[PDB]
């Protein structure tokens, strides 16, 4: 068949009903996949403490939402 991956990419259930209407607000769901229909929307992705702002572009399709909200601060030694 035309499909190269037999398994669908995972999306949480709250994004499966109202779709892009849920992507103009805070998102705790770092395990969801950024669909091609999510382009040109702004999301705030929870990193553990704060909702990190992210703008969805063409190059972010197929990634997880948590890949653009880092959870550990990049750290330096005195």
């Amino acid at each position: 068949m035309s499909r190269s991956v037999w398994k669908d990419p995972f999306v949480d259930a709250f994004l499966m009903k109202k779709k892009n209407a849920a992507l103009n607000r805070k998102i705790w769901s770092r395990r969801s996949t950024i669909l091609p229909e999510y382009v040109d929307s702004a999301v705030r992705i929870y990193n553990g403490k704060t909702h990190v702002r992210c703008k969805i572009t063409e190059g972010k399709v197929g990634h997880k939402f948590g890949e653009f909200a880092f959870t550990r601060k990049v750290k330096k030694h005195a």
Partner: protein, 101 residues
């Protein structure tokens, strides 16, 4: 229900997983047939994702039924290693003997 306080959440999760087993199997079987229409597969994926995450079998952790320890629990005896050794050295465990080969 069972008495040990640190086993309460696991017991509740086990009861919830026993409750939701048939729906989980039905939605996973609907999601497994590739010849089904895509709308039915998407709605069954939606209902599989709406099942409570505490009703999943992967959240269930084998704990000691006496003390509630989460680590080193033998599945046959359902007790931790400390309870196992204490009961085994007293001769309380049937068929358990000190091995000295």
């Amino acid at each position: 229900e069972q008495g040990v306080k640190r086993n309460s959440a696991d017991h509740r999760r086990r009861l919830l997983a026993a409750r939701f087993e048939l729906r989980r199997k039905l939605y996973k079987a609907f999601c497994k047939d590739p010849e089904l229409p895509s709308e039915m597969r998407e709605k069954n994926r939606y209902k599989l994702s709406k099942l409570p995450r505490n009703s999943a079998f992967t959240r269930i952790r084998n704990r000691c039924v006496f003390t509630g320890r989460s680590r080193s629990v033998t599945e046959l005896f359902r007790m931790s290693r400390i309870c196992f050794r204490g009961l085994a050295n007293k001769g309380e465990l049937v068929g358990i003997k000190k091995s000295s080969w």
